Design a protein around this ligand. Structure first.
Ligand code: S44
Length: 258
């Protein structure tokens, strides 16, 4: 039954997220954004509306686009969470709390799938923006980027596939030590359930790496630290960048988190 469970999670994953490792890799076998010219060209083609005006600084335009993808991923993650044994049985408040603290950890984890040493797949697989171009953005915007690449390079070295990743994201969501949780016991039990299936799955799908499970547990901790830091930088931008407004949904997510 745990094998079937793992499968269920994997199918929900393939079904709820527009992007996955296999699709990303086939594509990376896209318009390349490597400088300001290609950036502006990409915007006119892929998000025309955003530039059909008289327009904010390039850095802010990108920032807004990043927010847009996050809001979308929140929706995908919310639907995905229903395939986790016990999630849909939780109090609505706890479901909200679990998604609130888990979304960004999930987001940066899955982001690794479309990232390689030189850049990342963007805009529903229609673009590829270079890591170096992102580093060339003026501070503090160029500082949003790099930390995610650093994490992705190490995460991708674990050579996980979507069946692995789906369970990992599920595990990220089922976190009992999240602030405000009403029924921690039931949540801990749900968590124990997913980690158990994740442990067994890694064991059979990765017989060559006997430390994969421990490594991933560590990655979950890394992601949590990665997120608090990302939140800090977002906060800095919000306060110091007058033209860089934050989408209401994301403000609520960042509200009282870190
Ligand atoms: C290492 C960099 C990783 O990128 C990041 C970084 C942080 C975040 C989190 C965001 C930051 C505001 C958040 O807090 O929600 C999201 C992404 C995800 N960004 C995207 O998915 C993304 C989406 C669209 C684009 C565009 C931007 C321009 C150029 C090109 C076409 C079009 C217009 C979309 C790529 C770029 C990045």
């Amino acid at each position: 039954d745990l094998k079937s469970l793992a499968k269920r999670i994997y199918e929900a994953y393939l079904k709820n997220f527009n992007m996955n490792k296999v699709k990303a890799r086939v594509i990376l076998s896209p318009f390349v954004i490597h400088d300001m010219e290609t950036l502006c060209m990409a915007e006119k083609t892929l998000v025309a509306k955003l530039v059909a005006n008289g327009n904010k600084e390039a850095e802010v335009r990108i920032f807004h686009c990043c927010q847009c993808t996050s809001v979308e991923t929140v929706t995908e993650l919310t639907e995905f969470a229903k395939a986790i044994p016990g999630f849909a049985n939780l109090d609505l408040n706890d479901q909200v709390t679990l998604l609130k603290y888990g979304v960004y950890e999930a987001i940066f984890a899955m982001l690794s799938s479309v990232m390689n040493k030189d850049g990342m797949l963007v805009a529903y697989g229609n673009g590829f923006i270079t890591r170096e171009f992102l580093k060339s953005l003026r501070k503090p915007f160029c500082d949003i980027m790099e930390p995610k690449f650093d994490f992705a390079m190490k995460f991708n070295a674990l050579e996980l596939d979507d069946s692995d990743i789906s369970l990992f994201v599920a595990a990220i969501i089922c976190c009992g030590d999240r602030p405000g949780l009403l029924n921690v016991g039931h949540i801990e039990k749900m968590q124990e359930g997913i980690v158990h299936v994740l442990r067994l799955h890694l064991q059979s799908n990765h017989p060559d790496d006997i430390f994969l499970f421990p490594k991933l547990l560590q990655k979950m901790a890394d992601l949590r630290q990665l997120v608090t830091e990302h939140a800090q930088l977002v906060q800095i931008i919000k306060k110091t960048e007058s033209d860089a407004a934050l989408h209401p949904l994301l403000q609520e997510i960042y509200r009282d988190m870190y």
